[PDB]
């Protein structure tokens, strides 16, 4: 049940250094190669790099001059540092555990047999059954395929993923949202059910998270994706639908904007009239 938690700034200015931290749980960091994968909005996954238990880092060749990954086994932390960031570095950054291995292995064709030495340095395959021998043969009719050194298999895969941290590269400033209650005009609804919500207006950067009544109200809730307004700020709405009638039922939307260290708990009352 490995947990990987990314932490760091949600917003960075162009040409600044982005630095993220990955704190792990459910395992010791000294037994796993930990790495980073990012996904720019609506784009493909992109490998950044990793650092193995031995302390040697490995990086995406096209990016490694801007990347730095360091580790701290005692504090169970892996860092990512990206220098001189640009707009194109805006992305969700995923901390990951990784399997890496370079194996010169063997897939001898079904009409070949295991051989060793003679016509090959180290092990190889020999034609047919190699005349019942053990050393490789490369004299007619026998053919040898040697392990040589260019038949290496590079093995890579990600087993555990973090939830990811969204990072925005922008010269715009962090802006806390205004939160407004949403309730229908008195006599402008299709009851019995009552729909109400919150308008999370004009914030920067993403994301904002919305819950209702401190999580005690999951059912009937839908938080819509944010829209980017011409002002360069985001807005979104969250809506909740309930049986209605009331009371007791009070309704509070809990808006959290981590980037600005701000939380808003807005009381939404069903008008009155």
């Amino acid at each position: 049940q490995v947990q990987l938690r990314e932490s760091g700034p949600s917003l960075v200015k162009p040409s600044q250094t982005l630095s993220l931290t990955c704190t792990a749980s459910g395992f010791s960091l000294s037994d796993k190669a930990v790495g980073w994968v990012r996904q720019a909005p609506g784009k493909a996954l992109e490998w950044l790099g990793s650092i193995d238990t031995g302390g040697t880092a490995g990086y995406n060749p096209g990016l490694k001059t801007r990347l730095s990954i360091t580790k701290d086994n005692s504090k169970s932390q892996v860092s990512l540092t990206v220098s001189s960031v640009a707009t194109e570095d805006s992305a969700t950054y995923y901390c990951v555990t990784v399997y890496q291995k370079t194996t010169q292995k063997k897939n001898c064709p079904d009409d070949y047999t295991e051989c060793y030495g003679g016509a090959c340095d180290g092990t190889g395959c020999c034609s047919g059954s190699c005349g019942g021998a053990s050393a490789c043969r490369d004299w007619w009719p026998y053919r040898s395929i040697c392990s040589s050194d260019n038949t290496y298999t590079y093995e890579f895969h990600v087993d555990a993923w973090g939830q990811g941290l969204l990072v925005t590269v922008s010269s715009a400033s962090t802006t806390a949202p205004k939160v407004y209650p949403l309730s229908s005009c008195c006599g402008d609804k299709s009851s019995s059910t009552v729909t109400l919500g919150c308008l999370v207006s004009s914030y920067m950067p993403e994301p904002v998270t919305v819950t209702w009544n401190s999580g005690a109200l999951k059912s009937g809730v839908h938080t819509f994706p944010a829209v980017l307004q011409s002002s360069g700020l985001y807005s979104l709405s969250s809506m909740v639908t309930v049986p209605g009638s009331t009371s007791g039922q009070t309704f509070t939307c809990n808006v959290a904007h981590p980037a600005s260290s701000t939380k808003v708990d807005k009381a939404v009352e069903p008008k009155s009239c």
């Binding site: 994968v37 493909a44 996954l45 992109e46 490998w47 790099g49 990793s50 490995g58 990086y59 995406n60 060749p61 995923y94 399997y99 890496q100 291995k101 370079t102 298999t153 590079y154 093995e155 890579f156 895969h157 990600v158 087993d159 555990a160 993923w161 973090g162 939830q163 990811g164 205004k178 407004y180 209650p181 949403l182 309730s183 229908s184 005009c185 008195c186 006599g187 402008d188 729909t195 919500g197 308008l199 207006s201 839908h222 819509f224 994706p225 944010a226 829209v227 307004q229 011409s230 807005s235 979104l236 709405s237 809506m239 008008k271």
Partner: protein, 213 residues
Amino acid sequence: VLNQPSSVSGSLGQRVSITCSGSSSNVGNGYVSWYQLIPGSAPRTLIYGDTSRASGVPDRFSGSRSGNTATLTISSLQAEDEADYFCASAEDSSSNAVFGSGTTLTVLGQPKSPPSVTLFPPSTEELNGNKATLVCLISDFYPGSVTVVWKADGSTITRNVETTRASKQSNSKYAASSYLSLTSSDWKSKGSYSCEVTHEGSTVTKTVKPSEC
């Protein structure tokens, strides 16, 4: 980047194959892996080493490879399978991972559904700041494609409208939102505003009257 189709489909209960084309330097090297990305959730490893399944991956997910092309096949499609799928492969080095372009899977056979429409007037708190934002929330429609038209006193509005594109809810249908950004004075100067939502050639309209809120 490894080449995947941008999008593929396949109806419920059926199978579909997602290809991943590369060179002998990545895919042909013979250690392809597959990953599943459901929105609002962490990525999930499905396949590694071409054919081996990650822990807790059912048999209906299966991978294979033929030279420089790997294939992820998904049998018995369910609505939960709708997600982005990515292949991956090392190249010239185990620290040099190369992901595929990504494939958006769609699971068809879903029943058509009209949208529910809720139009919210501006709050008193927003009006006190001389702003007035009307919010039209659109939910539970299929297929996910609506057009939204705003009206004031029955006359069409082109200015100050912003509409989000449709995304899936945890109930498996679609939701979208549309915003009309007015000043407080604009909001009071009209008899009514309307949110007009068209879906599959049929339109649902909701109206609010400033006189009554």
